[PDB]
């Protein structure tokens, strides 16, 4: 569910995509960096971590998830490499989404996943991100 | 795009991280193998990116090398040394896989490195640069 997601609105937000993403995951943060390049899309990230490859990511994500304003802290994360400083845990959907991912059968990531229901593994660079998401917002 | 896809090689303590997408015919990614050869306290991860256009024998050779029992082992040995097993199978394998992800990504070009700020190096760098700059984006 979206409410399970950091939502990132950039500019007026009308174009939509979701990523299932590890906070520690370098090709997730790569698609962070080129979300950096474009405008008017929302980004709902659903927190994925895998715990086999990256020890640290579900704790990285539930800090990340329960900071005040969670978009300012995932983008601050991702692009920046800033890391809250004394973050606490609160109770959280990072556990639920994580399963989540797993029952669509997402095995890796980043997974994007579009309004019309289909998905990508992997990330894309721009300017070819942004088509992809375009042309999945129907179908 | 995921580390179980990769060749993971653990150099001393493994510390540092590094991906790397490489072509095992390409002799930049040799090069860059026998710099990392040269380093310690670090992990390397080696997608398989064959340019089939430019080496018409390396989809073959990617396949064999993950194809060995000990993974790693068999791939810095023809990188580093030139040891092939001749004898190895190919399996069910995610090469063709790993390829497609590296084209997806826009890599041109092996070596392609990777590191854990999502950063990427078109083109291997001499030790001690090559130390220099994986611990350097070790963060952003």
Same mark, same amino acid.
């Given at each position: 569910?979206?409410? +399970?997601?950091?939502?990132?609105?950039? =500019?007026?937000? +009308?174009?939509?995509?979701?990523?299932?993403?590890?906070? *520690?995951?370098?090709?997730?943060?790569?698609?962070?960096?080129?979300?950096?390049?474009?405008? *008017?899309? /929302?980004?709902?990230? !659903?927190?994925? $971590?895998? %715990?086999?490859?990256?020890?640290? %990511?579900?704790?990285?994500?539930?800090?990340?998830?329960?900071?005040? *304003?969670? %978009? +300012?802290?995932?983008?601050?994360? &991702?692009?920046?490499?800033?890391?809250?400083? =004394? =973050?606490?845990?609160? *109770?959280?959907?990072?556990?639920?989404?994580?399963?989540?991912?797993?029952?669509?059968?997402?095995?890796? /990531?980043?997974?994007?996943? !579009?309004?019309? =229901?289909?998905?990508?593994?992997?990330?894309? $660079? &721009? $300017?070819?991100?942004?088509?992809?998401?375009? +042309?999945?917002?129907?179908?």
């Amino acid at each position: 569910s979206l409410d +399970k997601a950091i939502k990132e609105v950039r =500019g007026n937000g +009308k174009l939509k995509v979701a990523v299932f993403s590890d906070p *520690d995951c370098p090709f997730c943060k790569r698609l962070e960096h080129e979300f950096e390049k474009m405008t *008017d899309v /929302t980004v709902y990230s !659903f927190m994925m $971590p895998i %715990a086999g490859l990256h020890p640290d %990511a579900a704790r990285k994500a539930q800090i990340l998830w329960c900071q005040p *304003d969670r %978009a +300012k802290a995932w983008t601050d994360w &991702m692009r920046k490499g800033k890391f809250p400083v =004394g =973050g606490s845990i609160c *109770d959280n959907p990072v556990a639920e989404t994580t399963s989540l991912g797993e029952q669509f059968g997402f095995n890796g /990531t980043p997974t994007l996943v !579009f309004p019309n =229901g289909r998905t990508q593994s992997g990330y894309s $660079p &721009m $300017p070819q991100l942004e088509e992809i998401i375009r +042309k999945n917002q129907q179908e």
